[PDB]
Design a binder for this molecule. Structure first.
Ligand SMILES: C[C@H](CS)C(=O)N1CCC[C@@H]1C(=O)O
Ligand SMILES: [Zn+2]
Ligand SMILES: [Zn+2]
Length: 219
């Protein structure tokens, strides 16, 4: 059996949700995302793999008096977007980048209700910022920055030990994207990857090194 959904406090106003899935060819994969609290409102940063876990996650917060204001998905793969269909059915606003919605469409998946283009997008003014560093893990990957906490949710772009599945990756672009990310959020207090433990700004350097190595190995 898979472990259950976990929800744990990370910082004042920020929780990490971890879900688990058996992935063909990769084994059991943990997935971290965040929940961010602003007053009595909650924002989901990435959805769990399944509608079932998305509902569990939402219910956990609703029980504690929060209203679910929005969800943002970091990239098109299912481990960031699997709960979109369910959230949309409940009229909970969902957000994704234009590129993400286009990839969802092409992949036969329900799109986020709201989208944005460009490099910086403020989901919540002064509190939650979405940044696009360029193609890497996927063409559309974005990160989420909480300036009040200096916490960067790097999602599936942050790959400190190895790049993982390159099926949708842009190996030529990843190093330039990773350098841009590291120069932008080099002062991060915490960096939260999708598939490995929370770390400090060093995870940005390691991702860059891995991207550079991967490109070299590809040539
Ligand atoms: C299925 C997920 C979607 S990012 C995936 O591609 N993974 C998870 C573990 C191996 C590989 C990765 O880590 O990039
Ligand atoms: Zn992915
Ligand atoms: Zn992932």
């Amino acid at each position: 059996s898979l472990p259950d959904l976990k929800i744990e406090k990370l910082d004042e106003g920020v929780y990490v949700h971890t879900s688990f899935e058996e992935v063909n060819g990769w084994g059991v994969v943990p997935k971290h995302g965040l929940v961010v609290l602003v007053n009595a409102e909650a924002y989901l940063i990435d959805t769990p793999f399944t509608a079932k876990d998305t509902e569990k996650l939402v219910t956990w917060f609703v029980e504690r008096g929060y209203k679910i204001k929005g969800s943002i998905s970091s990239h098109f793969h299912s481990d960031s977007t699997g709960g979109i269909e369910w959230l949309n059915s409940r009229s909970i606003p969902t957000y994704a980048s234009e590129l993400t919605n286009e990839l969802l469409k092409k992949d036969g998946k329900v799109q986020a209700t709201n989208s944005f283009s460009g490099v910086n997008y403020w989901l919540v003014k002064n509190k939650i910022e979405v940044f696009y560093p360029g193609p890497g893990h996927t063409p559309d990957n974005v990160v989420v920055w909480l300036p009040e906490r200096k916490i960067l949710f790097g999602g599936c772009f942050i790959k400190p030990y190895g790049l993982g599945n390159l099926g949708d990756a842009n190996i030529e672009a990843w190093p330039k994207s990773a350098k841009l990310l590291k120069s932008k959020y080099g002062k991060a207090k915490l960096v939260v990857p999708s598939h490995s433990e929370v770390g400090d700004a060093s995870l940005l350097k390691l991702t860059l090194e891995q991207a550079v190595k991967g490109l070299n190995e590809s040539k």
